[PDB]
Structures are given as C-alpha cells and as structure tokens.
C-alpha cells in the first residue's frame, strides 16, 4: 500500500514545530502535492525502518535490496499503464536480475538478514534453472507423453502388486 497523501515529505519530517503550522502549509509539504519520487522515498524509509537493523546505513546489501525493490515496484506500476514501453521493460527485467544477484549474495553471507528481507519485502527467492534450452513443440509433447506413460505404468504395477 502507498503512504497516505497527507504524509509529510521526508525532508520536512523532523524540522522542529512542523505540527504547529497551518493546514495549507501541511498540504504544501505533503505527498499530495509532490511527484512520485517523494512517495518512493517515503516507501524506502518505511521499509528500512521495518527491516534493517540500522536504518541509517544505506550502503549495506539489505539497504540496496530495499531500494532496488522500491525501484522495481515503480517500474511495474509504470508498465501496467505503458504496455509498449520496451525501454522500461528492459529496466524492470535488469533490476529484477540485479536484485536476484544481491539476494544470492545475502543468502550466502547473512541468512538471518536474508530471511528478514524476504519476509518484509514479500520476495520469494527461487533457484535458477540448471539448463537453458528451448522447449520446442516436439520436446514438450514427448515429455508430456513420457509423464503419462510413467503414470500408466505405475498404475499397472500397483494393480500387479
């Protein structure tokens, strides 16, 4: 879910006395009257507070994963509307690849933080396929038949025994 539009900008959230200003100033300094990048910054800060142990450290692998996850969500939201944007499709796919690489590094280095990142961001880590080969019509049909024939043989052997 997006932060409420009434939320203050990241840059005006700690200035002393921000609660004693007029409603007009509050609107002027909120997410309602800003571009989407400020909303993404607030999302990033929220995720950093929720997940990482030290939210001030932005150079850590977890922080980079959070930032790229927010960027990926932005790209997906863009592409729902812009179906023919090939450049942004490329950017989304490349960002997904980079996040998978960082997740692999995190899993190999810090499993607890890896689990926290996976739960907090709703990411499902998957292992890459072992072989990259075309699944053409002949192979697909043959594999389906082979699975069917194995099932039939299993049924026949169960009947026999």
């Amino acid at each position: 879910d997006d932060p409420p539009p009434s939320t203050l900008l990241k840059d005006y959230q700690n200035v002393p006395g921000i609660e004693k200003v007029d409603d007009v100033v509050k609107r002027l300094l909120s997410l309602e009257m800003a571009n989407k990048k400020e909303m993404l910054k607030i999302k990033q800060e929220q995720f950093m507070k929720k997940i990482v142990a030290n939210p001030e450290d932005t150079r850590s692998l977890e922080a980079r994963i959070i930032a790229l996850s927010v960027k990926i969500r932005s790209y997906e939201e863009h592409l729902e509307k812009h179906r023919k944007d090939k450049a942004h499709k490329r950017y989304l796919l490349m960002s997904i690849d980079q996040r998978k690489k960082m997740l692999k590094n995190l899993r190999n280095t810090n499993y607890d933080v890896f689990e926290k990142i996976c739960w907090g961001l709703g990411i499902e880590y998957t292992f890459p396929p072992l072989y990259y080969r075309r699944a053409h019509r002949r192979f697909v049909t043959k594999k389906a038949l082979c699975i069917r024939v194995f099932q039939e043989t299993q049924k026949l052997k169960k009947r026999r025994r």
Binding site: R137, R138, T141, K142, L145, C146, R148, V149, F150, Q151, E152, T153, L156
Partner: protein, 70 residues
C-alpha cells in the same frame, strides 16, 4: 577490402534466387512430403516409448498432435 568476394556473394545469391523461383512448385511438394515423414517419425518415436514401457496401446486420452502441419 576485397570487393570480388562481395560480387561473388551477389552472383551466387542472385543465381540461387532464380532457381527457387523456377522450381518453386516442385519445392513445395517436397517440403510437404518431408513434413509428412517428419510427423510419421515423431509418432513412431512416441509409439516406441509407450510400447517399450509395457503398455499395449497409448495412455488413455492421449492423441499425438500434429506439431509440423502449418
């Protein structure tokens, strides 16, 4: 650069394109027959599979699709 190789490529391609135009009707029949034989070979491979497995016929509900007919 050698322009003669580019010229020879031009001549060979132009000569090739003339042949396919001349024998176009013959080629289509040959390709259709080849695709028929291809489909038959694929079906025989599938039949060999279920025959070796032990089943006397194909698995119930299985029908070998035509994966080479346009």
């Amino acid at each position: 650069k050698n322009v003669l190789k580019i010229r020879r490529r031009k001549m060979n391609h132009h000569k090739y394109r003339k042949l396919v135009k001349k024998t176009r009707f013959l080629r289509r029949k040959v390709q259709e027959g080849r695709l028929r034989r291809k489909q038959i070979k694929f079906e025989k491979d599938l039949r060999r599979i279920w025959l070796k497995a032990g089943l006397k016929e194909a698995p119930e509900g299985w029908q070998t699709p035509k994966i080479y007919l346009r």
